[PDB]
Amino acid sequence: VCKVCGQKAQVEMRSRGLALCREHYLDWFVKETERAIRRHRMLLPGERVLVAVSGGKDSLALWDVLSRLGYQAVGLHIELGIGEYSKRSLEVTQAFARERGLELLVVDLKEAYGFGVPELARLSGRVACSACGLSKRYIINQVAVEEGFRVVATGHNLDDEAAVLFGNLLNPQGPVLPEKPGLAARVKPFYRFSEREVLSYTLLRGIRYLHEECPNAKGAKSLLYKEALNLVERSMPGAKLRFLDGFLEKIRPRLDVGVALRECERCGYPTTGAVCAFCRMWDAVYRRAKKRKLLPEEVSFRPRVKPLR
């Protein structure tokens, strides 16, 4: 039974001692997102913010919420070139943006750099997961800087953040990354939400999302990590939040840690090396693509990329 109005609740959140019907859950969700934003000063009221959108349940729900909160939320989708999956994610994201009035930017990896993520991985010598994340981070930051965005927002939630923290502790960062020269701020307005809560919002809002997951992350370690943390959450409501908050409040402030950033030789984006990880990756790729007749020898790639629409 809903707390506020007494209609039948459609979401029950033991970890908060809270049950809500559709209407008042949706209202609560939008408000709690803004609370997480205010708490860490993630976004100035009504400012431009670049949202990473893959069409997944998390990023679309985030686009919706930031939009309803009066932020100038512009989506940025990266066509990773992973077959039918990438095509379906593009269509969902495009459809989402057009069914509303939301401005969408798109960067196509193959059309821009010549290769998709899996081919990028094979040639570079990186695990596909690694090459994907590296490409995503570099490109969304590049677009943000080029288009004058101060901040990028991602749809990472509590399960995601708690699993990354857990994995670190098992095999031995935060909600807000500050703005630096040539480097937009990175924030995570959904980091207090469990995956179930975000998905529940997406369903109740009526958002059509891409249900299928990325083909490469089939047996990811994070899945194992999430399952153990959620096994605890089942018997102990609120454990994941206590876990993540405990690290940010009690452990990391008491934790002694160890380098200034440099403009990359090629593209001029911040890095500790002579050349950033991204250009380090593509240099090898092109060099080995040329060396294996997968790319004409008399071509040169310009680092800068233009987003369309």
Distances (CA, A) of 205 to 3, 190, 209: 19, 16, 11
| Shorter beta-carbon distance to Zn ion: residue 5 or 299 | 5
For residue 152, say whether it is annotated as part of any ligand binding site. no
For residue 135, say whether it is annotated as part of any ligand binding site. no
> Closest Cα partner for 204 from 65, 103, 92, 94?
65
Q: Binder to a second copy among 236, 274, 299, 308 (CB under 8 A)?
A: 236
CB contact set of 266 (below 8 Å; sequence gap of 6+):
275, 276, 279, 283, 303
Kindly identify the residues of this chain, within the stretch 37-66, that bind another protein according to CB under 8 A.
Answer: 56-58
Taking CA 37 as the corner, what is the angle to CA 209 and CA 16, rounded to the nearest 5 degrees? 75
Which residue stretch of 78-86, 110-118, 200-208, 254-262 sits at the interface with another protein (rule: CB under 8 A)? Answer: 200-208
For residue 58, say whether it is annotated as part of any ligand binding site. yes
Give the torsion through C-alpha atoms of 162, 167, 168, 170, to 10 deg.
120
Taking phi over 0 as left and psi of -120 to 50 as alpha, with beta for the rest, 244 belongs to: alpha
| Shorter beta-carbon distance to another protein: residue 240 or 266 | 240
Structure tokens at 179: 């703005």
The string of DSSP codes covering 173-193 is --SEE--BTTB-EEE-TTTTS
> Closest Cα partner for 47 from 61, 27, 66?
66
Kindly identify the residues of this chain, within the stretch 148-187, that bind a second copy according to CB under 8 A.
Answer: 169-172
What x/- string results for residues 260 through 289 when contact with Zn ion is judged by CB under 5 A?
----x-xx--------x--x----------
| Shorter beta-carbon distance to a second copy: residue 44 or 232 | 232
CA distance 66 to 48: 10
Break-preceding residues in the chain (C–N over 2.5 Å): 172, 258
How many residues are recorded in the chain?
Answer: 309
CB contact set of 136 (below 8 Å; sequence gap of 6+):
52, 78
Using the rule CB under 8 A, is 156 a contact of another protein? no
Q: Binder to a second copy among 18, 239, 275, 277 (CB under 8 A)?
A: 239
Q: Binder to a second copy among 28, 63, 225, 282 (CB under 8 A)?
A: 225
Shortest distance (Å) from residue 89 CB to another protein: 13
Kindly identify the residues of this chain, within the stretch 47-106, that bind Zn ion according to CB under 5 A.
Answer: none
Using the rule CB under 5 A, is 236 a contact of Zn ion? no
β-strand partners of 270: 263
Using the rule CB under 8 A, is 274 a contact of a second copy? no
**Contact set with a second copy (CB under 8 A):** 169-172, 221, 224-225, 227-229, 231-232, 235-236, 239, 242-243, 245-247, 249-251, 254-257
Q: Residues forming the annotated binding site?
A: 2, 5, 21, 24, 52-54, 58, 78, 129, 132, 155, 160, 214, 264, 267, 276, 279
Q: Which residues are annotated as a binding site for Zn(2+)?
A: 2, 5, 21, 24, 264, 267, 276, 279
Binding-site residues for [4Fe-4S] cluster, in ranges, read: 129, 132, 214
